Amino acid sequence: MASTDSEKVAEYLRRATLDLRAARQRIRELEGEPVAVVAMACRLPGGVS
Amino acid sequence: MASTDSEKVAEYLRRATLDLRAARQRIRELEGEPVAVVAMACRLPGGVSTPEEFWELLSEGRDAVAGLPTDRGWDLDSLFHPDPTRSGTAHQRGGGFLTEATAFDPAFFGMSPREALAVDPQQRLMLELSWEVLERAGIPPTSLQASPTGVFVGLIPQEYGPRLAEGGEGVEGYLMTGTTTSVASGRIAYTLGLEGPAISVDTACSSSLVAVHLACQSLRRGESSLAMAGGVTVMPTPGMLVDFSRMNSLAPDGRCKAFSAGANGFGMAEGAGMLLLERLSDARRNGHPVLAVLRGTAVNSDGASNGLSAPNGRAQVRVIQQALAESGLGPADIDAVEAHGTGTRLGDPIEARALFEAYGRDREQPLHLGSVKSNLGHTQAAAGVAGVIKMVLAMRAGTLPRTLHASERSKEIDWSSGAISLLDEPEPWPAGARPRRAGVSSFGISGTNAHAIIEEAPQVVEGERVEAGDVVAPWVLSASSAEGLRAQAARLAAHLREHPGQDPRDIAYSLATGRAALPHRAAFAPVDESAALRVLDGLATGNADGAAVGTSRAQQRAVFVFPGQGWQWAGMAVDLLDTSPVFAAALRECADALEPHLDFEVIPFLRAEAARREQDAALSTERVDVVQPVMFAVMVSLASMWRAHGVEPAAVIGHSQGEIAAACVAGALSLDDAAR
Amino acid sequence: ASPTGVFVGLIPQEYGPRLAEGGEGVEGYLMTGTTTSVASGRIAYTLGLEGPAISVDTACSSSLVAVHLACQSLRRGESSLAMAGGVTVMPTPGMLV
Amino acid sequence: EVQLVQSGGGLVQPGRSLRLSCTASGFTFGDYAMSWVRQAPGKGLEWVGFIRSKAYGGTTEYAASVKGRFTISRDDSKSIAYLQMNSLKTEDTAVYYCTRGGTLFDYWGQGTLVTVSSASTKGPSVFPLAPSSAALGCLVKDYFPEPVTVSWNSGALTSGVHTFPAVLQSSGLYSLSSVVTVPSTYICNVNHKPSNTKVDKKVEP
Amino acid sequence: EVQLVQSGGGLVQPGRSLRLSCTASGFTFGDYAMSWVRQAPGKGLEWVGFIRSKAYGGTTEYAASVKGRFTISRDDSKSIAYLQMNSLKTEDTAVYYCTRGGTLFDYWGQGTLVTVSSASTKGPSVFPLAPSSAALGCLVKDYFPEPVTVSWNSGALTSGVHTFPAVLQSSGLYSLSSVVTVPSTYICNVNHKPSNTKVDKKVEP
Amino acid sequence: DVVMTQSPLSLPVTPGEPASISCRSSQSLLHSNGYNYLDWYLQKPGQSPQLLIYLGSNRASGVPDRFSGSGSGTDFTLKISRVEAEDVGVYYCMQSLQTPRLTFGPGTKVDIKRTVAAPSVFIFPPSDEQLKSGTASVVCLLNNFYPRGAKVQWKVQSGNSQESVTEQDSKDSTYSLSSTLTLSKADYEACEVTHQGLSSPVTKSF
Amino acid sequence: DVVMTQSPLSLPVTPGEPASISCRSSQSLLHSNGYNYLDWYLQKPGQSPQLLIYLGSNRASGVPDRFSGSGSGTDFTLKISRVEAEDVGVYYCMQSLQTPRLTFGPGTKVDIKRTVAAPSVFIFPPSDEQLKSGTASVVCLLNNFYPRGAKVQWKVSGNSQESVTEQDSKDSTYSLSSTLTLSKADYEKACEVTHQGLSSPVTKSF
């Protein structure tokens, strides 16, 4: 626009790249997100409680 | 040069934006992919055994509640008492109950009669149901071997056979394989060879809808390319009728008076329903017919309600709103909802209040409230599947079914809003600009509330071309028994006499790709719908229409016994040799294997037309000099093709002269060596 | 009223009388306390839980398919928390015989 | 995550300077170009101007109405954006926004009230509203600054109640009118926090 | 979906023209800038040139080695890209690629064999390989072009078998050697499809 | 010259319906790169706005995918699949082709669709103690009218009246106007609306 | 000047292990926009290549997310979490700060890791009927050696050609073909490899 030829469209790069990163992170948090074991409750033979 | 980076920058747009469009559509097909209904399945109260008969039941407003069954050996005499609190006694004096759940086909599957006797009818009424839902789809049931196809069947533990501590006299070891909800999906996955996740869900009156929900999840994540979703409540022993009388919740008439002032209980019925679920892209890519599309489904619990049995209002509103939110749809996008409508005087008011809350608060048109249990009765774990059956049939016929015993709308429900219209009359539901959408709700006695959103199948099927041809495609039909063969001819004849105008090539194509190759085969090449119906009626009676029965027994644990003594008639021709890939591969391999010592080729003798070789024909036992080399070549080819064409063999042996013959298909040969 | 799904692994076991001869006081609870459907329902009701209260059955794999299924429900996002597991307690000497 | 939270609100008279700072955290500050927008109360917004990134270097654009008045600076080590007011006048009375890009204002801070008014904090002139025969109200005239909440029946009546917005007259003072529309002698109270002028009024036709 | 499938392969001698067309479907052709790359057999790709989009207009760049020889054109109504060979020489013997962008070659066609060889189709000179006392083989000398597929024991032996790649000598002819490594008098056959020269060989030490 | 960009203003939206907002451009905003250079913004009433769509069609992250858009070389369409209770505010059709970036457009104040109501014109003479306090403010109060397309006239003329409109409420989905006619001492010795709710002017004086 | 870009070549990868490939740049490829301008490509042996990573870190669609990458202003790292049987080919570290891009770099032909084998040097005198046919081709055949870091010397060189193939599946080795094209009278005048498999030169002649 003013000097070189990219200071309004590189912003479009930045926004599109952030959106793609957030969407692929959404993919990995809906199909590959680790699922934590908060706590454990068991009643097992041998008196285990 | 790049105009000082303008091409570079804009081209990086042209990849990052495209990747974002791909990844966001991946989000959409991974969270809200509209999964379609390929084939329908139901064994519902009354005479209903197919979805078309269920529509015939719904369209004319017939109630299936007739009475208690007598095939099951029920006492029926301790089942009632003047005292309502007598142990061993039930309250309802009927209910829509299956008249065919008592019988099952052991010989059709790999089930022994001893096994099938101990099999829970619920499971017996899923083996046949899975078979018939696969046939209806145009998908050969035996073609889904070792393939990803999840099974989701809902059931009710109840009680069927004798005490498992006491065992039995004829049934000892297969009582486990019968009276377990677990194997009520594993059996289906085993007999059909399905490798997909076999889950048998159990959530009381919403098990079927829960199962279809999970199947939706499995397809959206892509764990299984195909899904087997459904539910069932077969009614083997009258105990649950006896004990649902103990809290005084059963309607004495056994009828589900849904949203009615005369609701004196929620009644009861036994039935079965089943669906084929899978993502619409996999449908239209693979050509599987699409009956309807299930867009969104949610499953929630009632929470701390007024007891485990009492329903919850806010939880119901939450589930029927979350289904819309996950579907991308809303209260105004649903033209007619299929509520639970269990029929009790307490569940119906709060249920209708929840419907008025999620839907009725913001309605442009009056919501058409319906209940399948009014025509059928509360099918418990088969409720939720029967509802979606009703709504999909309403889609395909373009008419809203009636809600029987609903003329007197309940006085405990505020209908003054007008946003919900009780379906006491058949309301036309034609296809228009708005995509027709429906909702099915099922609230189990366990407190788990589920709701699903059924959109009409996208009308992109239209656009098919029309043509005519001289191809007399054979009408191939196969069964597991000779009587089954005669009955398969008769039912096809009845269908073509009651549904005339179906083009012969369409019938042949449907009979060929969609009907499995069963070990009793009768076929004919029709020229007219009269000459074909005469053949069908001839096979029905049992005369020789072509004198040809393709007989066999099973495919699993096959040992390839190889007897000789004369076979393999020289009756091949052009195109035939190139119809089967492994057949042609084996024939050409036997052709190319013998360069140095042999030069005679069987392909010119095979690919030659045999229409001229049928006038000097002879039995294959006296032409051994010419037949035997052909025996050897085509025996190699046929062993190789029957090894993997729907058969899972276990070994290969040799009864007579098939020893070196099956040793040559064990390798250890060269050009010169094989020739020698 | 919080989103949390109950996924209990169960094999249907015969506990008391048949459903057809319910006892003196145990009359209407012979399936509302024994049916595998209501096992997770009791968890969701006593705790006031509002989520997918799902009872699975896969014989000796039921518990792990319940863990898998709660995992998938969390992955998509239906309930903020998930409650998965399984049990095999045999009251009668039935499954051993 | 990201936050372009602002700071530097206050009350000034035309002809002096004011401070506006935009806190940057959760990203590389030298990659995005800071811009500033101004939102006139009750009507649409307007770009004040912007600064270009250091790696680009570039220059600073400002709006045609702020030439020679406002300047923008930036730094990475402390990651705080600077919008500078010099020689303020009346039109600057508006809430300003910190925007995350020269042409893509992809993120937006909460906004800080930059008020350039010719008044100082004084007490209000509450005037009632006599019905014709209907609705009853009470004007709140000559109060500064905005900080005022007006309830009816001392916070007891809530149906049909209004607090009319701040009214801009040429004197720099503001006006509010609270009214309730219901047939019948009501109580309306105005609390000016900075001045602690607690006014209770009784109205009759 | 998308496909930049190519067409125009053939066999030529240096000094003439050849046609290369890239079929565009599934996207707007005037948005992406066509480029062309060349892949020398057995070694790395070495770029050729590109054309800029009509909306941009621009010019056409080619590699420093193809100045005044190759030209690229484009059109939207028929959506077929054009790479033109004029005054071909030996180095052009390579498979060319149709690439979807001036600087981002984000998509790549299958590739067409553009062969500029000084030979014509003839028959091969199959020569055996005598073991020292081991492995046994048979050379395939002087054949053109390279569809040859060599088997051992007439397609019976498959363990330890080789088909050596096409060998580039200065005469324009090619060489192949098929060998099997196993102690022992074997059969190796070479089938040249264009020439129908079916050669069977027996080898002894 | 400066691109003339005027989206169709005043698009009321009621929850649960599909709406669509267009936009205008003097010359084409479609550049040689094949991409449009217009941005879509929604202004929160009460706090900061957010991004809906860039490139004319490419949606931003964080916001739900409901905010769909497309357009031709000149014609643009932020085509909003549905709206809810929180989907109320001011849409800005800001094009990004020639900085400086001063003008965002007049802005599309959007609200909840409802049937046309009757504007309640309430004339209110100023209090007498105000007349002895040195000022005078007669207010022709307008309440429960929708949409906002009316201005209060002042006869016996206008010019000393101010404009003090609020936002929309939830359960009633109406609007009210405040025409404050600041007045002086000696000139104290009628108000009108031209709202769509009625046709004929309704005259009531102090 | 032209950016010197040489990724470390010869990175063998065996299935089931984390590898990482770096790359070099003479001056910084990090532009004023805060983004890198290097692209990552993998050349199929036998058909068309595909895109792994652009912007130096931004991955392309279609390919699985296993192809992860990052880098500094100059140092770059396509850091590949794991490899499988199909993850074999030639990786190109192509830049994009200076058009024309020209060649894609010598390229990183990558293969399956395995222990160092013994190069089987097989000397083969040409057939006598070839010697009467007008040509002569003595071949020092090399088989089952890995990696490829050896050249066949010709004593008693310059007339030898190079004809190496790709990798197989079950054996995961390589073979070389040193074809020494020869003439008539010069046959009346030994081959060597310098492969890591051994240390001392192994001399065998025709």
User: DSSP string of A1-49?
Assistant: --SSS-SSSHHHHHHHHHHHHHHHHHHHHHHS-----------BTTTB-
- Looking at the fold, whether E107 and E144 belong to one and the same domain comes out as no
CB contact under 8 A, A8 and F33: no
Half-sphere exposure of F150 (CA within 13 A, CB side): 34
- Looking at the fold, whether G94 and G7 belong to one and the same domain comes out as yes
Instruction: Write the single-letter amino acid at C94.
Output: G
- B404: DSSP letter: T
User: Using alpha carbons only, what angle is made at residue G197 by residues G194 and G202, rounded to the nearest 5 degrees?
Assistant: 50
Q: Is F108 exposed, middle or buried (0-12, 13-18, 19+ CB in 10 A)?
A: buried
Calpha distance B42→B100 (Å, rounded) = 12
- Looking at the fold, whether G140 and G163 belong to one and the same domain comes out as yes
Calpha distance B342→D138 (Å, rounded) = 58
CB contact under 8 A, E187 and B671: yes
- Looking at the fold, whether E112 and E133 belong to one and the same domain comes out as no
Q: How far is CA B613 from the centre of its chain?
A: 45
Calpha distance G36→G96 (Å, rounded) = 9
- Looking at the fold, whether G73 and G85 belong to one and the same domain comes out as yes
Who's near B255: CB < 8 A, 6+ residues apart? B63, B65, B94, B95, B267, B343, B374, B377, B404, B405
CB–CB of C77/C5 below 8 Å? no
D103 touches chain A (CB under 8 A): yes
Dihedrals phi, psi of C56, to nearest 5 degrees = -100, 170
Residue B336, SS3 per DSSP: strand
- C47: DSSP letter: T
**Mutation to test the C interface, candidates B181, B224, B234, most C Cβ within 10 Å:** B181
- Looking at the fold, whether E16 and E111 belong to one and the same domain comes out as yes
User: Using alpha carbons only, what angle is made at residue G157 by residues G153 and G158, rounded to the nearest 5 degrees?
Assistant: 125
Cis geometry, peptide bond prior to residue F119 (ω within 30 degrees of 0): no
Calpha distance B144→B136 (Å, rounded) = 14
Nearest to F28 by CA among F58, F60, F71: F71
- Looking at the fold, whether G83 and G148 belong to one and the same domain comes out as no
Q: Which residues of D touch G (CB under 8 A)?
A: 28, 30-31, 53, 55-57
Calpha distance B244→D42 (Å, rounded) = 65
DSSP-assigned letters across all residues of B72-95: T----SSS--SSTT-TT----S--
Residue E122 is assigned to a structural domain of this protein: no
Option in B13, B17, B331 nearest F16 (CB): B331
Question: Which of residues F96, F113, F130 is at a domain's end?
Answer: F113
Residue B243, SS3 per DSSP: helix
CB–CB of D151/D132 below 8 Å? no
- Looking at the fold, whether D104 and D11 belong to one and the same domain comes out as yes
Label the pairing between strands D197-202 and D187-192: antiparallel
- Looking at the fold, whether G40 and G100 belong to one and the same domain comes out as yes
Number of residues that this document lists for chain F = 206
- Breaks following residues of chain F (C-to-N distance > 2.5 Å): 156, 189
The partner residues of E191 in beta bridges, in order of sequence, read E198
Cis geometry, peptide bond prior to residue F45 (ω within 30 degrees of 0): no
CB contact under 8 A, A31 and C77: no
Calpha distance A37→A48 (Å, rounded) = 20
Residue D77 is assigned to a structural domain of this protein: yes
Q: How far is F112 from chain B (nearest CA, A)?
A: 13
CB neighbours (10 Å) of residue B627? 20
CB contact under 8 A, B364 and F33: no
CB–CB of B265/B92 below 8 Å? yes
Number of residues that this document lists for chain D = 205
- Looking at the fold, whether E83 and E138 belong to one and the same domain comes out as no
- Looking at the fold, whether E133 and E75 belong to one and the same domain comes out as no
Calpha distance B115→B130 (Å, rounded) = 19
Dihedrals phi, psi of B288, to nearest 5 degrees = -65, 135
**Mutation to test the B interface, candidates E28, E106, E108, E149, most B Cβ within 10 Å:** E106
CB–CB of B405/B435 below 8 Å? no
Taking CA atoms, G76 is separated from D31, G17, G105, G195, in Å, by 19, 20, 15, 31
- Looking at the fold, whether D95 and D24 belong to one and the same domain comes out as yes
- Breaks following residues of chain E (C-to-N distance > 2.5 Å): 133, 184
Who's near B626: CB < 8 A, 6+ residues apart? none
The partner residues of E100 in beta bridges, in order of sequence, read E34
Nearest to F128 by CA among E164, D203, D166: D203
Instruction: Write the single-letter amino acid at C4.
Output: T
- Looking at the fold, whether E135 and E102 belong to one and the same domain comes out as no
Q: How far is A36 from chain C (nearest CA, A)?
A: 9
Residue D22 is assigned to a structural domain of this protein: yes
Nearest C-alpha in F relative to A9: F37
Cis geometry, peptide bond prior to residue F100 (ω within 30 degrees of 0): yes
Write b or e for each residue in D106-133: b if 16 or more Cβ atoms lie within 10 A of its Cβ, otherwise e. Answer: bbbbebbebbbbebeeeebbbbbbebee
Per the listing, tokens 């014609």 go with F75
Residue F99 with chain A: CB contacts under 8 Å:
1, 8
Calpha distance B646→B650 (Å, rounded) = 13
Taking CA atoms, E177 is separated from B69, E9, E138, in Å, by 82, 26, 6
CB–CB of B350/B441 below 8 Å? no
Write b or e for each residue in B115-144: b if 16 or more Cβ atoms lie within 10 A of its Cβ, otherwise e. Answer: bbbbbbbbbbbbbbbbbbbbbbbbbbbbeb
Who's near B13: CB < 8 A, 6+ residues apart? A9, A12, A13, A16, F33, F35, F55
CB–CB of B226/B152 below 8 Å? no
CB neighbours (10 Å) of residue F205? 12
Residue E121 is assigned to a structural domain of this protein: no
The answer to whether D and A touch (≥3 CB pairs < 8 Å) is yes
Calpha distance B626→B630 (Å, rounded) = 7
- Looking at the fold, whether E163 and E195 belong to one and the same domain comes out as yes
Tokens describing residue B328: 């991308």
CB–CB of F115/F107 below 8 Å? no
- Looking at the fold, whether G3 and G25 belong to one and the same domain comes out as yes
CB–CB of B334/B456 below 8 Å? no
Calpha distance C75→A20 (Å, rounded) = 19
Question: Which of residues F113, F135, F165 is at a domain's end?
Answer: F113
Calpha distance F48→D97 (Å, rounded) = 8
With the C-alpha atoms ordered D147, D153, D154, D158, is the resulting torsion angle positive or negative? negative
Residue A30 with chain C: CB contacts under 8 Å:
75-77
Q: Where are the beta strands (DSSP E) in E13-103?
A: 18-23, 34-39, 45-51, 60-62, 71-73, 80-85, 94-100
With the C-alpha atoms ordered E109, E115, E121, E123, is the resulting torsion angle positive or negative? negative
With the C-alpha atoms ordered B487, B489, B491, B497, is the resulting torsion angle positive or negative? negative
The partner residues of C31 in beta bridges, in order of sequence, read none
Calpha distance G174→G142 (Å, rounded) = 8
Calpha distance E197→E189 (Å, rounded) = 10
- Looking at the fold, whether D76 and D159 belong to one and the same domain comes out as no
Tokens describing residue B278: 């899978």
Residue E141 is assigned to a structural domain of this protein: yes
CB–CB of G61/B22 below 8 Å? yes
Number of residues that this document lists for chain E = 205
Task: Name chain C's partners: 3 or more CB pairs within 8 A.
Answer: A, B
The domain spanning residue E35 has which CATH number? 2.60.40.10
- Looking at the fold, whether G61 and G152 belong to one and the same domain comes out as no
The partner residues of B443 in beta bridges, in order of sequence, read B449
- Looking at the fold, whether D111 and D149 belong to one and the same domain comes out as no
Residue B183, SS3 per DSSP: helix
Query: Helices B581-593 and B624-643 meet at what angle, rounded to 10?
Result: 130
Half-sphere exposure of F102 (CA within 13 A, CB side): 10
In G, residues 30-89, which contact D (CB 8 Å cutoff)?
Answer: 31-34
Residue E180 is assigned to a structural domain of this protein: yes
Write b or e for each residue in B529-540: b if 16 or more Cβ atoms lie within 10 A of its Cβ, otherwise e. Answer: beebbebbbbbb
CB–CB of E25/E129 below 8 Å? no
DSSP-assigned letters across all residues of D132-201: ---EEEEEEEEEBSS-EEEEETTTTB-TTB--------TTS-EEEEEEEE-----EEEEEETTTTEEEEE
CB contact under 8 A, A9 and F54: no
Instruction: Write the single-letter amino acid at B453.
Output: I
Option in A1, A12, A18 nearest F61 (CB): A18
- Looking at the fold, whether G94 and G182 belong to one and the same domain comes out as no
- Looking at the fold, whether G80 and G134 belong to one and the same domain comes out as no
Tokens describing residue G12: 């063998």
**Could you tell me the strand order of the sheet in which D125-129 lies?**
D125-129, D135-143, D174-181
H/E element holding B325? helix B313-327
- Its domain, for residue D37, covers 3-116
CB–CB of F34/F84 below 8 Å? no
Per the listing, tokens 């005084």 go with B248
Nearest to F151 by CA among F167, F163, F143: F163
Dihedrals phi, psi of D116, to nearest 5 degrees = -115, 90
Number of residues that this document lists for chain B = 676
Number of residues that this document lists for chain C = 97
Tokens describing residue F129: 């103690």
Calpha distance G19→G24 (Å, rounded) = 17
Question: Which of residues E64, E89, E116 is at a domain's end?
Answer: E116
Nearest to F175 by CA among F97, F119, F126: F119
With the C-alpha atoms ordered C77, C78, C79, C82, is the resulting torsion angle positive or negative? negative
With the C-alpha atoms ordered C58, C60, C66, C71, is the resulting torsion angle positive or negative? negative
Per the listing, tokens 């009756």 go with B571
Tokens describing residue B418: 């007008």
Who's near C29: CB < 8 A, 6+ residues apart? none
How many domains are there within chain F?
2
User: Using alpha carbons only, what angle is made at residue F135 by residues F134 and F140, rounded to the nearest 5 degrees?
Assistant: 160
- Its domain, for residue F199, covers 114-206
Query: Helices B183-191 and B121-136 meet at what angle, rounded to 10?
Result: 40
CB contact under 8 A, B332 and F17: yes
- How was this structure determined? It was done by cryo-EM
Per the listing, tokens 């392309």 go with G60
Who's near G200: CB < 8 A, 6+ residues apart? none
Residue D137 is assigned to a structural domain of this protein: yes
Residue D122 is assigned to a structural domain of this protein: no
**Terminus-to-terminus CA distance in chain B, angstroms?**
70
Tokens describing residue B547: 């004198």
- Looking at the fold, whether F124 and F105 belong to one and the same domain comes out as no
Rg of chain A over Cα atoms, rounded to whole angstroms, equals: 24
Calpha distance G62→A5 (Å, rounded) = 31
Question: Which of residues E116, E145, E164 is at a domain's end?
Answer: E116
Question: Which of residues G113, G143, G177 is at a domain's end?
Answer: G113
- F126: DSSP letter: P
- Looking at the fold, whether F97 and F15 belong to one and the same domain comes out as yes
Who's near D204: CB < 8 A, 6+ residues apart? D130, D185
Who's near C77: CB < 8 A, 6+ residues apart? A30
Alpha helices, H only, B333-450: 347-358, 372-375, 385-397
Who's near B145: CB < 8 A, 6+ residues apart? B193, B646, B648
Tokens describing residue D187: 């109580």
Half-sphere exposure of B262 (CA within 13 A, CB side): 12
- Looking at the fold, whether E9 and E92 belong to one and the same domain comes out as yes
Who's near B413: CB < 8 A, 6+ residues apart? B259, B348, B349, B352, B353
How many domains are there within chain D?
2
Tokens describing residue B656: 């007579």
- Looking at the fold, whether G91 and G164 belong to one and the same domain comes out as no
Calpha distance G204→G123 (Å, rounded) = 6
Question: Which of residues D52, D82, D116 is at a domain's end?
Answer: D116
Instruction: Write the single-letter amino acid at G120.
Output: S
CB neighbours (10 Å) of residue D5? 13
CB–CB of G190/G155 below 8 Å? yes
H/E element holding B420? strand B420-422
Tokens describing residue E147: 């569809």
The domain spanning residue G164 has which CATH number? 2.60.40.10
CB–CB of B540/B490 below 8 Å? yes
